[PDB]
Amino acid sequence: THSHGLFKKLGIPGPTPLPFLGNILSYHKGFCMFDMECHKKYGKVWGFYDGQQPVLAITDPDMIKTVLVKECYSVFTNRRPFGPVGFMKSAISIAEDEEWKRLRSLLSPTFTSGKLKEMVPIIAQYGDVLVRNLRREAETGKPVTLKDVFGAYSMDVITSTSFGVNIDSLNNPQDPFVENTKKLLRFDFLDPFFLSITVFPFLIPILEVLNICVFPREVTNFLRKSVKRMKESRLEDVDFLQLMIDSQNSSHKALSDLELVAQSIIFIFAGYETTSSVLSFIMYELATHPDVQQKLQEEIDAVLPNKAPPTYDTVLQMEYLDMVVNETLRLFPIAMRLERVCKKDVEINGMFIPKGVVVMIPSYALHRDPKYWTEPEKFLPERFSKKNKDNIDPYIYTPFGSGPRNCIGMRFALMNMKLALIRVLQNFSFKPCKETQIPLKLSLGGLLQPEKPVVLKVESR
């Protein structure tokens, strides 16, 4: 209990921390639930201890804007440290302060709406590959596991948009380029290893000296040379790698070759498990709400008659599609929490925040708060219609974060997912099976994933 008396001093409420452990025994239900209960017992602001690390939760919308936007560069610039990360210290999502601001500048033009429009015909091709692999499992006439057919598509989109490799991953389950990227899995921070790091942060330097890394030494070594091969095989003869190779031919130093590999890995990590997981939560909400699934299939047939191919402009045209995606992200925000490290002794919105405190925003707990959402746990896509979309505080619904450090690929991800939904709904309908978990139970761990894999019926239109 070295720093366990800080919140009691400031008068901030919170649960009682055990020595050394702090409040980590409360994670037995998961992040999403320890947050909802704390929002209940204590109100708009409270605190707790991840081991000896004090964490200050905030739920006031005006106070959130100061953290994420206003005092972002001056105060709350970096995320909660974690390791050992090895060379992935150069990834944008991990870099801090000034190294981060240089990386955010060198990679921001990579994610403009102009570059995204040139990636659309490439991503659309794997929508067609997604249909043929789903039509073979539809004539199978038995339940189809979503995260396998969506994982194959998300894998396909990543390998092509980031490196230019074009593989049918579902029909090439043993390709070298596919074998490595499947070993990249989302970090479970309530799992044994990362919990020990939370209680023993002093062990992080020991692991760094042993070259141990949370990113496996082999998948990283496979890409560190694949890039340097492609940087010397494409050279000389619209992928993320090309845009980064173009960037180092000009804040204010060019992207290094190892920094190039770091961002490529972070893009694969980001677009792989997120795209396939969100697409799973959407089809579960459509199969259990056939009214929604039918209405969306009709909007798709109006913009794209004769099962016409979707384009960049035809996708941004659909609004009920954007309503369904936003509503699913409300009930299942894959981030759950937003966090920033306080680097100074500052006073925001009338409250003293000392240096070293981790400020946290419980996104999951705010997405299901009745103070802003009518019938929160119900899947009602009408909240985001242009009639009611104005009653939504942009600092309560933050699926992609907010401020200068929000998700840099928010819009590649939306385009990637909407293109998949359109082609899938132009050829199939989705019914619930007997083994379909209803209602869906979230995993008690540190990931926003279903307890049991989603299984649905798939029929051909």
Among 165, 186, 130, 170, which residue's Cα sits nearest to residue 240?
Answer: 165
- From start to end of 203-320, where are the E strands? none
Q: What residues does 359 pair with on adjacent strands?
A: 56, 340
Whichever of 104 and 228 has its CB closer to ligand HEM, that residue is 104
- Residue 261's binding partner among a copy of itself, ligand HEM, ligand NJO, none (Cβ under 5 to 8 angstroms by kind) is none
Q: Does 342 show up as a binding residue in the annotation?
A: no
> Which residues, 6 or more positions from 110, have their beta carbon under 8 angstroms from its beta carbon?
240, 243, 244, 247
Strands 346-347 and 352-353: what pairing? antiparallel
Q: Which residues bind ligand HEM (CB under 6 A)?
A: 68, 92-93, 104, 266-267, 270-271, 274, 278, 334-335, 338, 399-402, 405-409, 412-413
193: Cβ–Cβ under 8 A, 6 or more apart, which residues? none
Tell which residue, 270, 244, 269, has the closest CA to residue 257. Answer: 244
Based on the shown chain and the rule CB under 6 A, indicate whether residue 277 belongs to the binding site for ligand NJO. Answer: no
Binding partner of residue 198 among a copy of itself, ligand HEM, ligand NJO, none, CB cut-off 5 to 8 Å per kind: ligand NJO
Q: What's the distance, Cα to Cα, between the start and end of the chain in Å?
A: 63
Closest CA to 315 of 212, 419, 192: 419
In a 10 Å sphere around its CB, with 0-12 CB exposed, 13-18 middle and 19+ buried, how is residue 318 labelled? buried
Contact status: 57 vs ligand NJO (CB under 6 A): no
- According to the binding rule CB under 8 A, does residue 80 interact with a copy of itself? no
CA atoms within 13 A on the CB side of 152: 22
Does 2 sit behind a cis peptide bond, omega within 30 degrees of 0 on the bond before it? no
Contact characters 409-438, ligand NJO, x per CB under 6 A: ------------------------------
Asked if omega into 399 is within 30° of 0 (cis), the reply is no
Contacts of 396 (CB under 8 A, 6+ apart): 61, 366, 367, 369, 372
User: Binding marks (x or -) toward a copy of itself, 311..350, rule CB under 8 A?
Assistant: ---------------------------------x------
Contact positions with a copy of itself (CB under 8 A) in 204-223: 205-206, 208-209
- Contact by Cβ (8 Å): 157, 126: yes
Is 201 a binding residue for a copy of itself by CB under 8 A? The answer is: yes
84 to 103: interface string for a copy of itself, x by CB under 8 A: --------------x-----
Among residues 11, 202, 235, 237, the one that binds a copy of itself under rule CB under 8 A: 202
Output the smallest distance, CB 274 to ligand HEM, in A: 4
Does position 5 interact with a copy of itself (CB under 8 A)? The reply is no
User: Would you count residue 109 as binding a copy of itself (CB under 8 A)?
Assistant: no
CA dist., res. 226 & res. 178, Å (int): 13
Under rule CB under 8 A, residue 254 binds a copy of itself: no
Give min distance, CB of 193 to ligand NJO, in A: 11
202's contact among a copy of itself, ligand NJO, ligand HEM, none, with CB below 5 to 8 A by partner kind, is a copy of itself
Residues of the binding site: 407
Binding residues for heme: 407
Interacting residues with ligand NJO (CB under 6 A): 50, 79-80, 82, 93, 186-187, 189, 198, 266, 269-270, 273-274, 335, 407
Binding site for a copy of itself (CB under 8 A): 98, 201-202, 205-206, 208-209, 344
